[PDB]
Symmetry: C2
Subunit: 117 residues, 2 copies
């Protein structure tokens, strides 16, 4: 009969490979531009993470985003590609604003819970 063989580290290894690709600018199909900083990424990974980008890409190589800061987009990209959110009580309000406009629920829920109320 069929045997299922699970691979515990597989999804981490796939994400690590996609992160290596943006870091080298290899096989990226899109560039986001925010405050003069370029972010080579994958439209597929952005859409799996952000309902804003999913909507944008399912209806250019370059997309200029004006409604978030470069600092916040950097935190949010690093999270999408590495699974770790780097944040301070100085920039958490900025990260939360951006996560709410880009519609990234994991981030927007954790940031708002830190600040609730």
């Amino acid at each position: 009969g069929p045997i299922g063989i699970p691979f515990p580290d597989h999804s981490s290894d796939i994400l690590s490979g996609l992160n290596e690709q943006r870091t080298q600018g290899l096989l990226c199909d899109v560039v986001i531009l925010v405050e003069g900083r370029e972010f080579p990424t994958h439209r597929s990974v952005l859409a799996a993470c952000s309902q804003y980008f999913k909507k944008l890409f399912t209806s250019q190589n370059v997309y200029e985003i004006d409604f978030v800061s470069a600092e916040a987009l950097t935190a949010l990209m690093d999270f999408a590609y590495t699974a770790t959110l780097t944040v301070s009580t100085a920039n958490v309000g900025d990260i939360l604003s951006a996560a709410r406009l880009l519609e990234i629920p994991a981030v927007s829920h954790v940031c708002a819970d830190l600040l609730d109320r």
Copy 2:
């Protein structure tokens, strides 16, 4: 801050979204053709998963892959996008030869051991 908050299930969330994309033919940038069967996929994900595909995509939009069976490619694509490989007594040597040619070392190790037993 700065403080690195880990999200332990994020990598599986990303892969789940990539798998939904593939299952529907959405945001897929390449088609693999094997025995008249069409598999819409992402070259970034295949390269992250297979050293053969990494070299191929970093060296068209449709590729006919004649050196693996449709049965073996189906199993290996499901693996790439889900983290579980499903095999049987009857198809294990076939998945083992495809994993060696596609340079997917994690799969060939498990399959070799299954076959030798």
